[PDB]
Write a structure and sequence with these properties.
This is part of a larger assembly, with two copies of chain A, one copy of chain C, two copies of chain D and two copies of chain F.
Chain A (H helix, E strand, L loop, with lengths): L10 H11 L4 E2 L1 H28 L4 E2 L1 H11 L3 H20 L1
Helix pairs in contact in A: 2-3, 3-4
Chain C lengths: L2 H4 L6 H9 L6 E2 L2 H27 L4 E2 L1 H10 L1 H6 L3 E3 L15
Chain D lengths: L7 H11 L3 E2 L3 H26 L4 E2 L1 H10 L3 E3 L3
Helix pairs in contact in D: 2-3
Classes of the chains: A mainly alpha, C mainly alpha, D mainly alpha, F mainly alpha.
The structure holds a DNA duplex.
Amino acid sequence: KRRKTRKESYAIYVYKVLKQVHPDTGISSKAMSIMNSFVNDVFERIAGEASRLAHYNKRSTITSREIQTAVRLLLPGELAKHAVSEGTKAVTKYTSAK
Amino acid sequence: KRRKTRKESYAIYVYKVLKQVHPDTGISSKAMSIMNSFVNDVFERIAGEASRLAHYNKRSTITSREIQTAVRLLLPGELAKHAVSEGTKAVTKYTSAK
Amino acid sequence: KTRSSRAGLQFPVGRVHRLLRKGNYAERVGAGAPVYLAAVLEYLTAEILELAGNAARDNKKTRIIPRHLQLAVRNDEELNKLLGRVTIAQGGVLPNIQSVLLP
Amino acid sequence: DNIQGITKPAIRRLARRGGVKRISGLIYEETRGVLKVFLENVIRDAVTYTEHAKRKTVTAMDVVYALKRQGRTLYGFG
Amino acid sequence: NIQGITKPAIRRLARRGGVKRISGLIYEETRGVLKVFLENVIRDAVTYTEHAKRKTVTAMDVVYALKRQGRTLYGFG
Amino acid sequence: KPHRYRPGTVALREIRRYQKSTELLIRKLPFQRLVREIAQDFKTDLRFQSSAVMALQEASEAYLVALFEDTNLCAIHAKRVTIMPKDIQLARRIRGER
Amino acid sequence: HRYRPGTVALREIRRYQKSTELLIRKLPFQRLVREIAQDFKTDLRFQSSAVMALQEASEAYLVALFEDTNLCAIHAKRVTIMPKDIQLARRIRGER
DNA sequence: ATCACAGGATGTACATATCTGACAGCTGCCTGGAGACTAGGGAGTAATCCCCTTGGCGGTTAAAAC
DNA sequence: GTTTTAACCGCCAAGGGGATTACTCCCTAGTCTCCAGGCAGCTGTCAGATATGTACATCCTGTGAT
């Protein structure tokens, strides 16, 4: 009768990224749930690190610099530098557009 | 003649508690710093556990029962039950007063 | 026009911004912070999905299953370090047999 | 007396997945005790989470939160 | 400067740990382990300092670096 | 003379089979009964979702497999190929659970 | 007069478990910290308290590692710690 | 007389055909994200101070090296 | 046990920069309106699970042998 209350997940974005990296490969429901949980966990980790960074520096705003430092502190080695490059590219493009 | 900035610490309250539990006993500066760091760490732990408890239940207010659940989750057994007893007694007395 | 399209990202910048605002992380959230976080999340997802797709193709499968994700995570050194204390359901373990136990 | 439900073949299979080639006969009781302790901790945290929510049903999310609190994050259950 | 952690210092550290007999190859392994641990902690501390736009590594930076690695240290703020 | 594999071929075959597979190795009903019996000591008349029991079983099996890998490493350290309770105790003591 | 091989080891164990002062010399450890930090950022300065905290953390970590290494050595029916004991301890801990 | 093959037995990887149910795509809609403004204070920047970090230097001896 | 050396301590000196204060501006919270991106719901169909028979892979013991 009544539709279930909507529950937001990262399924469609993960599917788009998968189609970008593997046009012919699909994904199962359990794997999609695992990917969604991974995204949530990484988001929580980075956001908590950025919040702690802002608190340590007596700042009231989380900006690109705080997230970038959180990424450098949380991701190991090549993952950190590649994520930094991708994020700086995205921020530069976003500020270049509007 | 530049007065140093105000740095808040739990030193006076720890000293009062020490005089309550041991009247003829002192505490060094390093031990006082260690106790202050312990108080800060436990405060952060309980506050974070209460915050995630509130977020999980989709609540916006940290109440006495959230702190109680955080204490029950974080403390090992008899410590947890005695801390809960002390907290409930303090809350009851505060509510009774005004 | 979505903020994700401006940054050339597939992850939702607006949803990340709302979660940052409503996640009790700071009093204010910057404009570029959700963009940067969405880019990082998209990159990590792309890395894991690429490795999992490689594993699936190596196992003659076209759909990624939890076993492929577990293999991808534990075969990549940095990804294994990032998810060291993470358990993937139905992922199993790697085929590791100690050399002393072999015949 | 449900700890005996974790039979010797189950512990042997778990050891084989862990790479164990030869198992002593006293391993099973120790494994059962360790499993009981671990389940006691996780279930205690899960029941605490459920009681805080004023619920009578232990949910998968409660178990996930309990595992995360103990540094044993689990993926695939929300 | 890793050689500055002399053999008697490692022996003293082992004695505090209850070690009675020490092999001759323990010292290089201990130096390597200490170097790795210090590299990680110092890298995190320098990252914290750089985020603060400071040029002096403070005790709070080291404390935060240790706390991030699950090694909370009391007595320094 | 009936065919008999030597004592250790079948063990290695089992190792390979159970490392290639991903299904749960403990029977579902006994584990559910054990979970309910343990939960009886914390709160009476508790109900359990199926996903909760599945997650508990997954976590328990992962923990037991990791503990058994550590136990095998400890037994190999002692120049043995047989795991013993002392190996498990050493592994749990080094991990920091005892 | 000569003590038997192990009396002085036990005496030192008791002495250093009674004591609480740092066991590594301050200047070599500070030089090692500066050398390690040089690879991360140049012209870095260090507070004295930062180096003291680093020394305390490093010594505590090494003492715990040596305790685990001693336990590993005892497990192998030995009284001498070996590099394989340290490697086993770090592998069980989840560091290598 | 102790050591390579011979061959038998067992298991497992490998085509091949059915079938099914779970995954991928389409649809309706509604709620959350985007556009367009204003207010205000959080933060960027400049000036200053002093303190606390760094550098040096000689003597002692405890500790390191052998 | 003997020989060497640099850690430590006390002292002095210079200045780099951490911390503070003032100012100001522009970036984000807040609000209103609007619309379309994403979510629940169906639904079809093909990827994989399930037999099923078969071709090796491998193990193990007898046995011939240099």
